[PDB]
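pipeline/complex-builder :: batch 7 item 3
reading input block
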Amino acid sequence: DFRGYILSVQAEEQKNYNNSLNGEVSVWVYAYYSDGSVLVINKNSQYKVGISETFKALKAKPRAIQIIFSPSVNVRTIKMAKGNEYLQRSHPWEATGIKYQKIKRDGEIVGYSHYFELPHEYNSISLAVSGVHKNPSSYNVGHNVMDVFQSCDLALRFCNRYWAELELVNHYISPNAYPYLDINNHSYGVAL
Amino acid sequence: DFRGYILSVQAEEQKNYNNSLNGEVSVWVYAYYSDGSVLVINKNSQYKVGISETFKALKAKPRAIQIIFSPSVNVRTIKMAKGNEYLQRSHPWEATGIKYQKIKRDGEIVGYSHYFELPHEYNSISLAVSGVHKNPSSYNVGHNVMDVFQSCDLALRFCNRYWAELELVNHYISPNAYPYLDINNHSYGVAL
Amino acid sequence: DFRGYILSVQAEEQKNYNNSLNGEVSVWVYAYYSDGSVLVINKNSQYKVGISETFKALKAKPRAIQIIFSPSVNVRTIKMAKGNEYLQRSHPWEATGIKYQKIKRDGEIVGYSHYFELPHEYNSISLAVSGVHKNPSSYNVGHNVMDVFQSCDLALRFCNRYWAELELVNHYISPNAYPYLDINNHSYGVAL
């Protein structure tokens, strides 16, 4: 019965494509609001990827954040900036890769997660996060620098709001086979 | 009568400036909606140029797209990404330069056009397109890389909606001397 | 009494950090509207920084602009583009550093200011401005080019509207220790 053997090699080809510099890097930012709704920003790009957004009061204030990267990211390149400290005394970013948890399904890394809560004394947060593809060629930009400039133009961004997390998991996470970690610490994703 | 000879050289100077790395690259994306209205995004920049936008239902759904580049683009560098296929199996872009038509006026290339229709089964499209200036120095980024970084900041974007294509051609295309191809396959533009 | 001597060295450390390539570059664009209100866009980033925005009629039309950079900028790298001249004959930017005034407090440069008025015959302006950190290493991008690509993702942008300039100075400029120059030519800022 050959049907099985071919399916196995075609998954190995997919992992090798995704780990090449033609594989995407994906990031998601989930903002958890006080009315129980969830706002998600997703950006997908080649070479590197980032999000920079302002999360303010809606129709309800944001209370926590979860940032998730695809497994192609180099966790050590992850950087995050946040604010709304005087400018004279500010650092440009922090390297937060050590705070990311591995999301696993069937013992396979499907993503990396950084969850943190926001102080109650706030109703707004401005936030930016950035990560680079883990391929060993990433810091060897001779591929051409202009290819990376084009990737900045071709990055696609998606933004959606859901009424509760259960709706997010059932109609956004599960049908799209995305990695996730919900309020009850249940893992989602599809191992290759 | 000298008035004529000078006018001719000053057009040759303009073409040579536009074909130098100080010439702009321009892109337009036209989205044709079901109520007959047209939405246009224009971006102009040095070295390279791109647009990334989401075209969703209005007050009416988008039905086709036309992408137009200025003649300074290198058609072989054009890349386009599109979506809303699972992420595990996605390619970052397609090279679509071969699908672009030359727009001509008086036998002179005034622009390059890619028109495609959208499936009826959709009411949204997310789309990004990118192109690089054709000057032979484009892939020789030693000009400095920081100059190209500044160009990303200085790119100007314009967005307008028109009630019908005739209004677009009469009050946007014709008075601004832009290249275009309308529903009846008529060409617009001004030869240098 | 040692309390004084330590405070002095810690200011010298701050200036040296800000003048290193880990110091931020900051830009502000103030748009002064006909009803006396003020719109401000602020962007802060590492290596280089820019803003590109469209200032159109509100609820009232914009009448003048003030652009302010932090002292870390190289004034000679400042570039500005502006419009809404035919595209065939356009330049990509002008170098406007010579038009910037030094803002000083206690004989110390706290910022650089370019103020200009808009023609009465307009109700809109599209505008982009860009500047590079003055550290001598800025044009030596071997730090890696990918670090500069990440900085583009991590830049944070802030946008606020105020009813009159007095409210801007009292609740935005003064409490945040920002450099400024008001309608009566009074200087604001905090010397290090």
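note: Residues 92 and 165 of chain C are 32 Å apart (CA to CA).
queue -> next item
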